Amino acid sequence: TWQWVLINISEEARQRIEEYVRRISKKEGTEVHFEKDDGVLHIRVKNLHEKRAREIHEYAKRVIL
Amino acid sequence: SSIFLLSNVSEEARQRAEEYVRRISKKEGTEVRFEKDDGFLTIEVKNLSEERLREIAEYLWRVA
């Protein structure tokens, strides 16, 4: 289980990250839970491998930048 | 595992963010990793309670 807490990110970056995680969760057969507050985006992915987590984290920094 | 990602934070704010999480992980006995990548600060904690996770999220949001 991997949880991301993205702080004060763009609305377009949040959209690209959510869609990227949903595609990864669909192909891996797991489900992802999103939570949104003002400036804080929660992403909780059950049963995620370690290489997938690093990939999601690198893509997050790519689109948030 | 929980991953806190901050963007364009000052080194002043980076020290406060890291110091806050360290004593939390020091009290719970959990692994914590701090990684800097240009204007990004990654705070990765393992097996941290959601009660503590919301605390860190509220502090980092007030810091950022």
Author numbering:
A (entry chain A): 1 to 65
B (entry chain B): 66 to 129
Verbatim from the authors:
We set out to design sets of interacting protein pairs for constructing reconfigurable assemblies. We instead sought to use implicit negative design by introducing three properties that collectively make self associated states unlikely to have low free energy: First, in contrast to the flexible coiled coils and helical hairpins in previous designs, we aimed for well folded individual protomers stabilized by substantial hydrophobic cores; this property limits the formation of slowly-exchanging homo-oligomers. Second, we constructed interfaces in which each protomer has a mixed alpha-beta topology and contributes one exposed beta strand to the interface, giving rise to a continuous beta sheet across the heterodimer interface. Our implicit negative design principles enable the de novo design of heterodimer pairs for which the individual protomers are stable in solution and readily form their target heterodimeric complexes upon mixing, unlike previously designed assemblies.
We determined the crystal structures of two class one designs, LHD29 (2.2 Å) and LHD29A53/B53 (2.6 Å) in which both protomers are fused to DHR53. In the central extended beta sheet, the LHD29 design closely matches the crystal structure (red and green box and Table S5). Aside from backbone beta sheet hydrogens bonds, this part of the interface is supported by primarily hydrophobic packing interactions between the side chains of each interface beta edge strand. The two flanking helices on opposite sides of the central beta sheet (blue and orange box) contribute predominantly polar contacts to the interface, and are also similar in the crystal structure and design model. Apart from crystal contact induced subtle backbone rearrangements in strand 2 of LHD29B that promote the formation of a polar interaction network (blue box), most interface sidechain-sidechain interactions agree with the design model. Association rates were quite fast and ranged from 106 M−1 s−1 for the fastest heterodimer to 102 M−1 s−1 for the slowest heterodimer LHD29, which is still an order of magnitude faster than the fastest associating designed helical hairpin heterodimer DHD37 (10). LHD275A, LHD278A, LHD317A, and a redesigned version of LHD29 with a more polar interface (LHD274) were also predominantly monomeric. For the C4-symmetric hub in the absence of its binding partner we observed an additional concentration-dependent peak on SEC, indicating formation of a higher-order complex. This is likely a dimer of C4 hubs, since the C4 hub contains the redesigned protomer LHD274B, that despite its reduced homodimerization propensity compared to parent design LHD29B still weakly homodimerizes.
